[PDB]
Design a protein around this ligand. Sequence first.
Ligand code: U6V
Ligand code: ZN
Length: 257
Amino acid sequence: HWGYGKHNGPEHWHKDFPIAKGERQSPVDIDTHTAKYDPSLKPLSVSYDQATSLRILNNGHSFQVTFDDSQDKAVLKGGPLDGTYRLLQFHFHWGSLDGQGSEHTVDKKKYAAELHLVHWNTKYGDVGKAVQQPDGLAVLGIFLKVGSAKPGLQKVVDVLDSIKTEGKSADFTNFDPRGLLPESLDYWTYPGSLTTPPLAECVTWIVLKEPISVSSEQVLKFRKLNFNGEGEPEELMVDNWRPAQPLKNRQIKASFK
Ligand SMILES: NCCCN(CCc1ccccc1)CC(=O)N(CCc1ccc(S(N)(=O)=O)cc1)Cc1ccc(F)cc1
Ligand SMILES: [Zn+2]
């Protein structure tokens, strides 16, 4: 039932998911002047060399690339995290126009899109159990700005025509997510939530300061996707982002001065 339209969008989600008005919801505005450098934070460890991508999928609210998480292949460690987090999937949020689309904002600035690499804490054994824990998931968030093309994204863009509508999937093997990462791993971190239902308060957010650049042609292909299933009125998959939520009793820490 939930979505991103006038009658089922983020302002309605609290009726089915009352945690939507909770104490650690995401996304948030990152006020760069109030985030405090935390010298105790460790460098992030992004170890993706052995990643095994499986499928690319239109799930009716985004498109996602799924990975084999049956083994410690692609893992996130370090930074604010205790333990090992396995990469499950990545997906994006994006806008109808280049001036909106990100979920997090930086000094109220919205980027054209935001990439989420979703990882779960292996001490909980499976992702369903991890979503029930305050430290169950770690999501690495990367902003997209429109400029030069990102070569490492093109293999994604070129297959989207084959998953236009909800439910459609395709083989998507041998995709290397390292090609989506910016140079710097400087980041902000705070405790938050899933940004789509069930909005569970289970996520350590790690948001990279450095955006990646993508071309207008690449993001325009995102905007050709469909929220609807095949044979239903065509509703473009655009503006599939939740707006910034109240920070409440939280501090955003920076890994960098
Ligand atoms: N209608 C949505 C169809 C499927 N959707 C949830 C289904 C649902 C809906 C309402 C109530 C219960 C369940 C996605 C899903 O299933 N995920 C991904 C969850 C997720 C990951 C990252 C972010 S993000 N944007 O990076 O913060 C947000 C959300 C795995 C999972 C596995 C086990 C769980 F118990 C829950 C989620
Ligand atoms: Zn997301």
